[PDB]
Amino acid sequence: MEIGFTFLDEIVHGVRWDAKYATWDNFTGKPVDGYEVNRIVGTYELAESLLKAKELAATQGYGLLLWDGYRPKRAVNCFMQWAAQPENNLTKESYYPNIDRTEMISKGYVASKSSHSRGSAIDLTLYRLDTGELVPMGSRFDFMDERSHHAANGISCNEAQNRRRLRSIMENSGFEAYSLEWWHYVLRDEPYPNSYFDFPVK
Amino acid sequence: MEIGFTFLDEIVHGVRWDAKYATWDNFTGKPVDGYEVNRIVGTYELAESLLKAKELAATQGYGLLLWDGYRPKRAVNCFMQWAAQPENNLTKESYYPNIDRTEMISKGYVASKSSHSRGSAIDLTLYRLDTGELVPMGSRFDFMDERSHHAANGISCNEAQNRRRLRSIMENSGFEAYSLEWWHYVLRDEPYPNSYFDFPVK
């Protein structure tokens, strides 16, 4: 395991993650390059702050479900390559209706460079601690639509509120949100900005 | 970690599992009791034989995707409790159309006792090594229908053949198949028959 990085599962004890990119259940239809393990990897500092966010279980009984943490540069390249492929309509309906695969790298859904490769960015949700179900956010992970924006409309009051709560828990835990994606958070004072890693998640 | 058991991912190196029960993506709609960490746990002997089955990568370029290995008794109880709950139609369409939740524990889909609790049973599939996609099996994991039977009809020649290949790889690796579920395999000479464990998957 790379230095300054750890498997977050051993730090965030009772977490029920699902490494989306380590399974065929993502927008590309199959595990992205560099993902040979269904585990979330991350920087010790990310784990530390995630622990603080998860301890905000004090909020409205929420649990966190992690989807993606550190993402290898090659995974980002894999995304870019995928965006450049002809439309097979395999994941369109679920991940990007309303947008075309042509404009993926212009509307800015799949950039050439990801904060994830720095190891301090995380994708997550919150599940009800009391009921166990997933807190409704109005759009799915990797929705790639204006619907996924924090400030989005067309989302119910509960869904918008829910996003606000996720954000609040993250911001109060050392993270910075991102307006275009309610699920995206980056550690505010990350250990390796400028550093885009490429070791595999395994 | 319990004795004679290990995290399979540490033995089965480049495996791309997806602990279905450790995520809301199962028939109950949420992580079953005992499923905390998104990892496949199993007996050393199960790992040993899974390694042999995975080395049958020699077959038609197949990779294995693990869904479930050791399953705590409490997870089995959780399934039973779920089967006894009123129908909310939340997962019906995907996991059990054609069957009713009333007859779940009679048609034998959710028994009071699972070979999984012995730690040598495994649920898996094979993905094409060459292309990367999932090998089509005709029915989804936990389909709970006659369609899920190894000898089932209503499944294409390729799909039936595919199941046969999974089975063959497993049988040649020390496993015994189960006719009612193409994904179910049990180690033939398992270390703890008669032993139904209840430590959590974490």
Side-chain angles (χ1 to χ4, degrees):
Chain A
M1 171 90 288
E2 175 81 10
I3 206 52
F5 281 80
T6 181
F7 301 102
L8 310 178
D9 37 48
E10 297 166 44
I11 307 299
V12 192
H13 286 260
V15 72
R16 264 100 165 136
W17 85 94
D18 185 49
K20 279 310 186 199
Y21 299 139
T23 319
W24 296 254
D25 196 42
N26 56 259
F27 63 88
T28 79
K30 43 180 161 185
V32 199
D33 181 24
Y35 285 81
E36 295 171 64
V37 115
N38 195 319
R39 292 179 76 180
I40 313 296
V41 170
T43 246
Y44 278 114
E45 293 86 349
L46 171 58
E48 267 187 62
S49 292
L50 255 188
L51 186 46
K52 302 200 222 98
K54 132 140 167 53
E55 273 162 346
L56 274 179
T59 296
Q60 267 51 89
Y62 301 114
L64 306 173
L65 143 69
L66 321 179
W67 285 318
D68 194 43
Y70 158 70
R71 174 182 317 170
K73 269 163 65 185
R74 67 184 89 176
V76 181
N77 298 344
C78 183
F79 288 138
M80 290 294 291
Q81 289 282 75
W82 172 89
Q85 300 307 299
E87 194 49 77
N88 44 218
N89 283 284
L90 219 77
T91 56
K92 200 169 189 316
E93 277 305 278
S94 287
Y95 296 92
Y96 55 105
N98 317 329
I99 257 82
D100 201 274
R101 220 198 279 204
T102 276
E103 51 204 23
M104 279 284 192
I105 59 155
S106 250
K107 289 174 150 73
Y109 295 120
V110 187
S112 324
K113 218 174 189 57
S114 178
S115 41
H116 274 281
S117 311
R118 299 186 229 122
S120 294
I122 183 73
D123 286 336
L124 74 176
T125 356
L126 330 132
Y127 67 93
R128 288 271 299 253
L129 236 42
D130 62 323
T131 208
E133 296 121 69
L134 283 173
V135 172
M137 296 292 180
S139 77
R140 127 219 297 284
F141 164 63
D142 276 352
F143 190 47
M144 245 91 107
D145 192 84
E146 295 181 344
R147 197 106 191 291
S148 298
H149 295 358
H150 255 119
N153 38 253
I155 260 90
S156 69
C157 282
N158 282 343
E159 297 173 337
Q161 182 186 43
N162 287 331
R163 297 181 177 195
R164 274 159 38 211
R165 296 194 191 192
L166 206 211
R167 183 187 224 153
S168 179
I169 286 162
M170 302 306 282
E171 291 175 342
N172 281 314
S173 303
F175 294 87
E176 223 38 65
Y178 178 49
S179 53
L180 307 195
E181 292 158 5
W182 64 262
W183 60 80
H184 182 78
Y185 299 91
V186 196
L187 204 56
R188 203 173 294 137
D189 293 299
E190 65 186 290
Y192 314 106
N194 320 318
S195 293
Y196 299 76
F197 304 91
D198 199 27
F199 58 93
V201 184
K202 90 146 311 301
Chain B
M1 171 90 288
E2 175 81 10
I3 206 52
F5 281 80
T6 182
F7 296 103
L8 308 180
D9 45 46
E10 294 169 28
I11 306 299
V12 189
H13 284 250
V15 69
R16 285 143 156 148
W17 78 101
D18 200 66
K20 279 309 185 197
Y21 297 138
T23 329
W24 297 254
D25 196 42
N26 56 259
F27 63 88
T28 78
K30 48 182 143 195
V32 201
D33 187 20
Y35 286 91
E36 327 221 67
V37 156
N38 190 330
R39 285 174 82 186
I40 314 297
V41 170
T43 246
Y44 278 114
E45 293 86 349
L46 171 58
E48 267 187 62
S49 292
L50 255 188
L51 186 46
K52 302 200 222 98
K54 132 140 167 52
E55 273 162 346
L56 274 179
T59 296
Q60 268 51 89
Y62 301 115
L64 313 176
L65 146 66
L66 321 179
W67 285 318
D68 194 42
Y70 158 70
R71 175 181 317 170
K73 269 163 65 184
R74 67 184 89 176
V76 181
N77 297 344
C78 183
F79 288 138
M80 290 294 291
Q81 289 282 75
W82 172 89
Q85 300 307 299
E87 194 49 77
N88 44 218
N89 283 284
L90 219 77
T91 56
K92 200 169 189 316
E93 277 305 278
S94 287
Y95 296 92
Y96 55 105
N98 317 329
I99 258 82
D100 201 274
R101 220 198 280 204
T102 276
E103 51 204 23
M104 279 284 192
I105 59 155
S106 249
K107 289 174 150 73
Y109 295 119
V110 187
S112 324
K113 218 174 188 57
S114 178
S115 41
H116 273 281
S117 311
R118 299 186 229 122
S120 294
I122 183 73
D123 286 336
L124 74 176
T125 356
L126 331 133
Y127 68 94
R128 303 302 326 288
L129 236 42
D130 49 358
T131 191
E133 292 96 278
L134 281 173
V135 172
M137 296 292 180
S139 77
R140 127 219 297 284
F141 164 63
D142 275 352
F143 190 47
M144 245 91 106
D145 192 84
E146 295 181 344
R147 197 106 191 291
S148 298
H149 295 358
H150 255 119
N153 38 253
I155 260 90
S156 69
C157 282
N158 282 343
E159 297 173 337
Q161 182 186 42
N162 287 331
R163 296 181 177 195
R164 274 159 38 211
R165 296 193 191 192
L166 206 211
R167 183 187 224 153
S168 178
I169 286 162
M170 302 306 282
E171 292 175 342
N172 281 314
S173 303
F175 294 87
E176 223 38 65
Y178 178 49
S179 53
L180 306 195
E181 292 158 5
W182 64 262
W183 60 80
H184 182 78
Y185 299 91
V186 196
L187 204 56
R188 203 173 294 137
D189 293 299
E190 65 187 290
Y192 314 106
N194 320 317
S195 293
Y196 299 76
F197 304 91
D198 199 27
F199 58 93
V201 183
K202 90 144 309 302

Short mmCIF file of all heavy atoms in Angstrom, two decimals, chain A residues 52-53 56 59-60 62 64 126 137 150 160-177 182 185 188:
data_model
loop_
_atom_site.label_atom_id
_atom_site.label_comp_id
_atom_site.label_asym_id
_atom_site.label_seq_id
_atom_site.Cartn_x
_atom_site.Cartn_y
_atom_site.Cartn_z
N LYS A 52 -14.60 11.61 11.18
CA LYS A 52 -15.29 12.72 11.81
C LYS A 52 -16.64 12.92 11.17
O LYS A 52 -17.61 13.24 11.86
CB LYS A 52 -14.52 14.05 11.68
CG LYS A 52 -13.11 14.06 12.23
CD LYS A 52 -12.65 15.50 12.49
CE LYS A 52 -11.21 15.72 12.04
NZ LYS A 52 -11.13 16.35 10.69
N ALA A 53 -16.77 12.67 9.85
CA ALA A 53 -18.03 12.90 9.19
C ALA A 53 -18.98 11.77 9.54
O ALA A 53 -20.18 11.98 9.70
CB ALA A 53 -17.80 12.91 7.68
N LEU A 56 -20.65 12.07 12.69
CA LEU A 56 -21.83 12.89 12.60
C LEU A 56 -22.92 11.91 12.18
O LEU A 56 -23.45 11.91 11.08
CB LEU A 56 -21.75 14.13 11.66
CG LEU A 56 -21.18 15.45 12.25
CD1 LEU A 56 -21.15 16.53 11.18
CD2 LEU A 56 -21.97 15.93 13.46
N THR A 59 -26.13 13.59 13.63
CA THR A 59 -27.12 14.26 12.77
C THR A 59 -28.38 13.38 12.59
O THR A 59 -28.60 12.50 13.42
CB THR A 59 -26.52 14.92 11.49
OG1 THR A 59 -25.63 15.96 11.92
CG2 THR A 59 -27.58 15.57 10.60
N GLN A 60 -29.09 13.36 11.45
CA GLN A 60 -30.38 12.66 11.55
C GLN A 60 -30.26 11.18 11.26
O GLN A 60 -30.80 10.67 10.28
CB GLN A 60 -31.51 13.32 10.76
CG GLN A 60 -32.32 14.30 11.60
CD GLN A 60 -31.44 15.30 12.32
OE1 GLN A 60 -31.13 16.36 11.78
NE2 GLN A 60 -31.03 14.95 13.53
N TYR A 62 -27.63 9.23 10.28
CA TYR A 62 -27.12 8.91 8.97
C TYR A 62 -25.83 8.11 9.05
O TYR A 62 -25.02 8.25 9.96
CB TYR A 62 -26.88 10.15 8.10
CG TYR A 62 -28.09 11.03 7.82
CD1 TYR A 62 -28.14 12.32 8.32
CD2 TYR A 62 -29.15 10.59 7.04
CE1 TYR A 62 -29.21 13.15 8.06
CE2 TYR A 62 -30.23 11.42 6.76
CZ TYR A 62 -30.25 12.70 7.28
OH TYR A 62 -31.31 13.53 7.02
N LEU A 64 -22.69 6.56 6.35
CA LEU A 64 -22.14 6.95 5.06
C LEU A 64 -21.86 5.73 4.21
O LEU A 64 -21.37 4.72 4.71
CB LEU A 64 -20.82 7.70 5.26
CG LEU A 64 -20.82 8.90 6.21
CD1 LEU A 64 -19.41 9.41 6.42
CD2 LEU A 64 -21.69 10.01 5.65
N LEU A 126 -25.53 9.01 2.50
CA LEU A 126 -25.83 8.74 3.87
C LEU A 126 -27.04 7.83 3.90
O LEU A 126 -27.95 8.00 3.09
CB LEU A 126 -26.18 10.03 4.63
CG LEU A 126 -25.53 11.34 4.18
CD1 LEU A 126 -26.59 12.41 4.05
CD2 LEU A 126 -24.48 11.78 5.19
N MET A 137 -31.71 11.31 -2.51
CA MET A 137 -30.98 12.50 -2.93
C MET A 137 -31.50 13.10 -4.23
O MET A 137 -31.00 14.11 -4.70
CB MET A 137 -29.49 12.20 -3.04
CG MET A 137 -28.84 11.83 -1.72
SD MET A 137 -28.76 13.22 -0.57
CE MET A 137 -27.97 12.44 0.83
N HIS A 150 -25.81 20.47 -6.56
CA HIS A 150 -26.21 20.80 -5.19
C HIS A 150 -27.39 21.77 -5.16
O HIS A 150 -28.37 21.55 -4.45
CB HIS A 150 -25.07 21.37 -4.38
CG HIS A 150 -24.54 20.39 -3.39
ND1 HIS A 150 -23.25 19.94 -3.42
CD2 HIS A 150 -25.14 19.77 -2.35
CE1 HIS A 150 -23.10 19.07 -2.41
NE2 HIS A 150 -24.23 18.93 -1.73
N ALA A 160 -33.46 17.93 -1.63
CA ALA A 160 -32.55 19.08 -1.58
C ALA A 160 -32.00 19.25 -0.16
O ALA A 160 -30.83 19.60 0.05
CB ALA A 160 -33.28 20.35 -2.01
N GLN A 161 -32.88 19.02 0.80
CA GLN A 161 -32.52 19.11 2.22
C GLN A 161 -31.51 18.03 2.58
O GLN A 161 -30.56 18.27 3.33
CB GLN A 161 -33.75 18.97 3.10
CG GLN A 161 -33.44 19.10 4.58
CD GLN A 161 -34.63 18.83 5.46
OE1 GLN A 161 -35.38 17.89 5.23
NE2 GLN A 161 -34.81 19.66 6.47
N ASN A 162 -31.76 16.85 2.06
CA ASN A 162 -30.90 15.70 2.28
C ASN A 162 -29.48 15.98 1.78
O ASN A 162 -28.51 15.69 2.48
CB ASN A 162 -31.47 14.44 1.64
CG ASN A 162 -32.67 13.91 2.41
OD1 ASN A 162 -32.78 14.10 3.62
ND2 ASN A 162 -33.56 13.24 1.71
N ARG A 163 -29.38 16.55 0.59
CA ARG A 163 -28.08 16.91 0.03
C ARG A 163 -27.39 17.92 0.93
O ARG A 163 -26.19 17.85 1.18
CB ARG A 163 -28.26 17.51 -1.36
CG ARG A 163 -28.85 16.55 -2.35
CD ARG A 163 -28.99 17.19 -3.71
NE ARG A 163 -29.50 16.25 -4.69
CZ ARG A 163 -29.45 16.44 -5.99
NH1 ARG A 163 -28.92 17.54 -6.48
NH2 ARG A 163 -29.94 15.53 -6.82
N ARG A 164 -28.17 18.90 1.35
CA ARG A 164 -27.69 19.91 2.27
C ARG A 164 -27.11 19.30 3.54
O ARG A 164 -26.10 19.76 4.06
CB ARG A 164 -28.79 20.91 2.60
CG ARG A 164 -28.90 22.05 1.59
CD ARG A 164 -30.27 22.69 1.65
NE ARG A 164 -30.77 22.77 3.02
CZ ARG A 164 -32.06 22.72 3.34
NH1 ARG A 164 -32.98 22.60 2.39
NH2 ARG A 164 -32.43 22.77 4.62
N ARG A 165 -27.76 18.25 4.04
CA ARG A 165 -27.30 17.57 5.25
C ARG A 165 -25.99 16.82 5.02
O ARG A 165 -25.11 16.82 5.88
CB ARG A 165 -28.38 16.66 5.80
CG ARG A 165 -29.61 17.42 6.25
CD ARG A 165 -30.52 16.56 7.08
NE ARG A 165 -31.81 17.21 7.28
CZ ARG A 165 -32.71 16.80 8.16
NH1 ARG A 165 -32.46 15.74 8.91
NH2 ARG A 165 -33.87 17.42 8.26
N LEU A 166 -25.89 16.18 3.86
CA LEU A 166 -24.67 15.46 3.50
C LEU A 166 -23.53 16.47 3.47
O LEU A 166 -22.50 16.31 4.13
CB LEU A 166 -24.81 14.83 2.10
CG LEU A 166 -23.97 13.58 1.77
CD1 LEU A 166 -23.63 13.53 0.29
CD2 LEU A 166 -22.71 13.47 2.62
N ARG A 167 -23.78 17.54 2.74
CA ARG A 167 -22.83 18.63 2.56
C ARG A 167 -22.38 19.19 3.91
O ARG A 167 -21.19 19.35 4.16
CB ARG A 167 -23.51 19.72 1.74
CG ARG A 167 -22.62 20.91 1.41
CD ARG A 167 -23.44 22.01 0.75
NE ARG A 167 -22.74 22.57 -0.39
CZ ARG A 167 -23.35 23.14 -1.43
NH1 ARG A 167 -24.68 23.23 -1.46
NH2 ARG A 167 -22.63 23.61 -2.45
N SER A 168 -23.36 19.50 4.74
CA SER A 168 -23.10 20.05 6.07
C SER A 168 -22.23 19.12 6.91
O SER A 168 -21.32 19.58 7.61
CB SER A 168 -24.41 20.37 6.80
OG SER A 168 -24.14 20.87 8.10
N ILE A 169 -22.50 17.83 6.85
CA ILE A 169 -21.74 16.85 7.60
C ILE A 169 -20.30 16.81 7.10
O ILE A 169 -19.36 16.72 7.87
CB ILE A 169 -22.38 15.45 7.48
CG1 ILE A 169 -23.65 15.38 8.34
CG2 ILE A 169 -21.41 14.35 7.88
CD1 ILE A 169 -24.58 14.25 7.97
N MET A 170 -20.16 16.93 5.79
CA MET A 170 -18.85 16.91 5.17
C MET A 170 -18.08 18.19 5.46
O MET A 170 -16.92 18.14 5.87
CB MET A 170 -18.98 16.66 3.67
CG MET A 170 -19.69 15.36 3.34
SD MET A 170 -18.94 13.93 4.14
CE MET A 170 -17.53 13.66 3.08
N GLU A 171 -18.71 19.33 5.22
CA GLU A 171 -18.07 20.62 5.48
C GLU A 171 -17.64 20.77 6.94
O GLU A 171 -16.56 21.30 7.22
CB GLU A 171 -18.95 21.78 5.00
CG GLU A 171 -19.06 21.83 3.49
CD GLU A 171 -20.01 22.89 2.98
OE1 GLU A 171 -20.84 23.38 3.77
OE2 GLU A 171 -19.94 23.21 1.77
N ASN A 172 -18.45 20.28 7.86
CA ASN A 172 -18.12 20.35 9.28
C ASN A 172 -17.06 19.31 9.65
O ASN A 172 -16.62 19.25 10.80
CB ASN A 172 -19.37 20.11 10.13
CG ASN A 172 -20.27 21.32 10.24
OD1 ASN A 172 -19.81 22.44 10.47
ND2 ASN A 172 -21.56 21.11 10.05
N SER A 173 -16.65 18.51 8.68
CA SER A 173 -15.67 17.46 8.93
C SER A 173 -14.37 17.65 8.16
O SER A 173 -13.54 16.74 8.07
CB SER A 173 -16.28 16.08 8.66
OG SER A 173 -17.44 15.90 9.46
N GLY A 174 -14.16 18.86 7.67
CA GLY A 174 -12.94 19.16 6.94
C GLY A 174 -13.01 18.98 5.43
O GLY A 174 -11.97 18.88 4.77
N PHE A 175 -14.20 18.91 4.86
CA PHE A 175 -14.33 18.75 3.42
C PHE A 175 -14.89 19.98 2.75
O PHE A 175 -15.50 20.83 3.39
CB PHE A 175 -15.25 17.58 3.09
CG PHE A 175 -14.71 16.26 3.50
CD1 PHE A 175 -14.93 15.78 4.78
CD2 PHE A 175 -13.97 15.50 2.62
CE1 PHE A 175 -14.43 14.56 5.17
CE2 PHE A 175 -13.47 14.28 3.00
CZ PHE A 175 -13.70 13.81 4.28
N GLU A 176 -14.65 20.03 1.46
CA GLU A 176 -15.17 21.08 0.61
C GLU A 176 -16.07 20.39 -0.39
O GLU A 176 -15.70 19.35 -0.96
CB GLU A 176 -14.02 21.80 -0.10
CG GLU A 176 -14.16 23.31 -0.12
CD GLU A 176 -14.72 23.87 1.17
OE1 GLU A 176 -14.05 23.75 2.23
OE2 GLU A 176 -15.84 24.42 1.13
N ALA A 177 -17.28 20.90 -0.56
CA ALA A 177 -18.23 20.31 -1.50
C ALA A 177 -17.92 20.77 -2.91
O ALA A 177 -16.97 21.52 -3.14
CB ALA A 177 -19.64 20.73 -1.12
N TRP A 182 -23.56 16.63 -5.92
CA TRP A 182 -23.86 16.50 -4.49
C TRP A 182 -23.04 15.44 -3.74
O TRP A 182 -22.89 15.52 -2.52
CB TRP A 182 -25.37 16.28 -4.30
CG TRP A 182 -25.88 14.99 -4.89
CD1 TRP A 182 -26.49 14.81 -6.10
CD2 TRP A 182 -25.81 13.70 -4.28
NE1 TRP A 182 -26.80 13.48 -6.28
CE2 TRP A 182 -26.39 12.78 -5.17
CE3 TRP A 182 -25.31 13.23 -3.06
CZ2 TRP A 182 -26.48 11.42 -4.89
CZ3 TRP A 182 -25.39 11.89 -2.78
CH2 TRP A 182 -25.97 10.99 -3.69
N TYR A 185 -16.85 15.29 -2.56
CA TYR A 185 -16.23 16.05 -1.49
C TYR A 185 -14.73 15.88 -1.52
O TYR A 185 -14.22 14.79 -1.77
CB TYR A 185 -16.80 15.64 -0.14
CG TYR A 185 -18.27 15.90 -0.10
CD1 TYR A 185 -19.18 14.93 -0.49
CD2 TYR A 185 -18.75 17.16 0.23
CE1 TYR A 185 -20.53 15.21 -0.55
CE2 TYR A 185 -20.10 17.43 0.20
CZ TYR A 185 -20.98 16.46 -0.20
OH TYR A 185 -22.32 16.74 -0.28
N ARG A 188 -10.34 19.59 2.57
CA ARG A 188 -9.92 20.97 2.40
C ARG A 188 -8.42 21.19 2.39
O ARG A 188 -7.90 21.93 1.56
CB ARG A 188 -10.51 21.71 3.59
CG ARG A 188 -10.70 23.20 3.42
CD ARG A 188 -11.45 23.75 4.62
NE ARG A 188 -12.83 23.25 4.70
CZ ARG A 188 -13.42 22.84 5.82
NH1 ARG A 188 -12.75 22.85 6.98
NH2 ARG A 188 -14.68 22.44 5.78
#
